[PDB]
Amino acid sequence: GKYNLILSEYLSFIYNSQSAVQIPIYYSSNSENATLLSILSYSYDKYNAVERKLVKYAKGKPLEADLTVNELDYENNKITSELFPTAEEYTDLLMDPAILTSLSSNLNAVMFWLEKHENDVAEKLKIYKRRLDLFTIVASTVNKYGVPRHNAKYRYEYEVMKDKPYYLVTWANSSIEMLMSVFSHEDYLIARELIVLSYSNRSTLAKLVSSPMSILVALVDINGTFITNEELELEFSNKYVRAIVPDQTFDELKQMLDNMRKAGLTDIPKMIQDWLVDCSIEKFPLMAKIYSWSFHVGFRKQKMLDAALDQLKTEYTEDVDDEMYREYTMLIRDEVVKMLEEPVKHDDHLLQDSELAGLLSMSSASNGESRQLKFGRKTIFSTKKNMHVMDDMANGRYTPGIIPPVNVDKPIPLGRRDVPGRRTRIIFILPYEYFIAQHAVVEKMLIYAKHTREYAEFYSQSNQLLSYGDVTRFLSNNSMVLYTDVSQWDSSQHNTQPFRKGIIMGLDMLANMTNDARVIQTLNLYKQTQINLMDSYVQIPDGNVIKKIQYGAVASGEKQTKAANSIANLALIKTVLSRISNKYSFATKIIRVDGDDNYAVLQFNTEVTKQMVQDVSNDVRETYARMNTKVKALVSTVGIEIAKRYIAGGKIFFRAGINLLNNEKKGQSTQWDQAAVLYSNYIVNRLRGFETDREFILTKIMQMTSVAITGSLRLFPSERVLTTNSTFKVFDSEDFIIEYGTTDDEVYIQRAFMSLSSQKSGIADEIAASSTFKNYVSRLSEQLLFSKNNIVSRGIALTEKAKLNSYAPISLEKRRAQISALLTMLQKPVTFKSSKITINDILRDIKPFFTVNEAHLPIQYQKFMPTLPDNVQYIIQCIGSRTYQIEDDGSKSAISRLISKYSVYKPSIEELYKVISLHENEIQLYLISLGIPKIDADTYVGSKIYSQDKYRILESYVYNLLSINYGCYQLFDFNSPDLEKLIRIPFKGKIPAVTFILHLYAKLEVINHAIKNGSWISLFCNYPKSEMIKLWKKMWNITSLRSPYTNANFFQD
């Protein structure tokens, strides 16, 4: 236990007074060698805690802000009284960190670290002397204007920020995030320029540093690559491809290094300067270090008019060539007929009721407008769209046929989504009837995209070498890759008229291919959303006035914007590659589009020279410019930039910009949930090359998970509360290892968190008894089936109860009751007694039968991701990277091929697991509640194919429990021939459920032993026949511990 040692040492630092006492609370598994639950703390003298210890670190000179480096007047670091004159006009939304942790908490987490490492040995001393020279700059600037005391909900009022500079809080937050990631001398020279210059230059610093990364991935030679097959399976190929670069790229890379010297950066353009002499892959992680560090400057929060002015003001002309727009509109028309040819001819059940298909899946839509609703006696304000339907279905206003206009009378409100170092993107806020019309038709466009080679939904898995590995499979010395960066994709001229009229023309060739009266109707309503968006006005508020701007283009926030933007690229890059073939003769190997970032691999006849690269790039940005789409045409021979991934020289490099101590939107979480987002943003940045200290993170989990009931008492939970596998998990003991503990007091506490895993909310039980909720449930049972049954109607009325957990105040009355019920268990050490099978109860019976021995494995495979940590790179080089991805979606089964066809619901794999192990007449009672007819659910039960479907659901459910497809286990090959020489388990037939879990648990204990220690072990399990039958009856009653904030911990982006 190491977190318990830092927890006791922290409270002896922040409470320096004599009146502070700490009472540890212990507990045991027996009645009468004990692990501790929490640590009490009574401290009374608490005024001026941080402002007294800051003065001993405030030396040197403070930073004087430069006031003539930004174009706008409210982006400079001026005094707030000089910027906002009165307290009535004070906008917090330009500097708000939007995290529930104040600046006075972040300064104690550094001053606690600087005391523990004040007198270390000569290797760890140089890290301390580099993190002290940076903290002198941060402390002496804050101490001049003082420390701003936060609000009760962690905002900053006007009266505490009156005499300070405006961005003092949101600069001291990001600079503490940067100085706690300095490890080498190269990391100290980057952090000094991004701390000094970031005090004045709040506009164009993250753009100048992160600019030359699209160029530098085209200079590094390839010597050995990973490729992928036609089906997505990995291969290793060791060709040699030379990098060819024209003389105008180096005349552009020299321009990017002289823009970085006008801004004042004088030691970041010396590392790129000294790397270009070699152009080597062995020094390239220095060039991705500078690209990853540039995103930690901070967010560019601006006014909504001032950030949507260059986007909404474009020059549309009629001096384009109209001969090129006829082929562009025809190629969009040919795709929509090609996508909906099979679900319209054979009339699918999903298109026949598009009104019901959007109603039962409106929890996937974006948040709409803020509207006043009335649910019985209560009056609530909500932006979720399925709450707008329950108010509109009661008052006699629910008309899904009539689609409202978005012209000058009723404009479209606008929301933003921004990323540091890029421009901002606007998001439409559409009514709730643009989601119902565009859901059953777009879902038929995204099943064709999962079987077509040129789209992005084909190469969409959990791994990252199998998805973006088709870039380098066509690479040779006679080919070139052509990745182009369209600047303003949203409002270009090729998107307003010919894109909406290419879809409308494609839905008129599908109104003559069918014979039902319903499929003509759902293809007419999807056509009606395109004529109304042909002339759309947008609404942007500024000051007193509200501006209405005409905007006939395509923005995000729609439903079709992920599958119809991919059609407009494959029709536009097919027209440009046909105009460039009048000067050259090639053969297009692959085209692959993902939104608005794409590539295309052209294979030439003769060898590629330096003249065929400079003159193809001048025929891409001159053919695009004939269609009024200005682009930055880039061609390369070795490496590209596919979407946020940088494949340079055979290796794949990611970006590591995730802001830990800042956020872009004010989230609706608690502190306990944002202490697991802060940890899971540290594991992501550690795997990509931005290593923050662990002891700064573990200090930040101490200051966020603690909760007080009185102003003098504090409760700090221990390691065994936060690390155990339950609802309340925050972090793990070792970093990349998910451990399931097996001790008689560790299963005793995991069952003790099973009582208060389900709490009730006082808001959702008053909505569910109101009259307008019963009117919404009653009119869904009419459309779902023509009959009336009492079983299906309670099965519907208790399904929209869980849909109200997406509402933000309802999902906060549960979580505020989780932590307030935990405090009665951390104070009273005795708990309750119950029995319920978890995953740890199964592993209690398997672990005493494994015998370990020492073993060795020589390295045989090489590394394709060179920014991974050292203990994970020993696993990959010894057992191999993943070759093929095993699916856990369950759609290969025969019950998930029946639910998806005959109904619109989607049941969770934790729901299909519980019902597949019951009798025949219990699967019947469940399948009718899904919407399946009685004659179909009598077929599947009466066919006895559920007996052979028991093992296709348990295979995909155990892979979800142990998190094999997600986490950091999605890199190692599990069917490798080098893990089977270590696992030696004799085979005993006729029980497949137990033999499967003996080989999946033995494969994890060998991997989790070689990350902790770096040495391999071999296992042997002579499991008896009398213990296999006892474990066989517990493989079906296993229950999982699901949490809402943990479902985001499975994916990276």
């Binding site: 309670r794 729901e911 019902v915 019951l918 219990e922 469940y926």
Partner: peptide
């Protein structure tokens, strides 16, 4: 009261019909 709670498991319906092996 969800539907997954009300439907009884296979081991519950195997106890309303009793017999001894030997």
């Amino acid at each position: 009261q969800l539907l997954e709670v009300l439907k009884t498991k296979e081991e519950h319906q195997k106890e309303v019909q009793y017999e001894i092996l030997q």
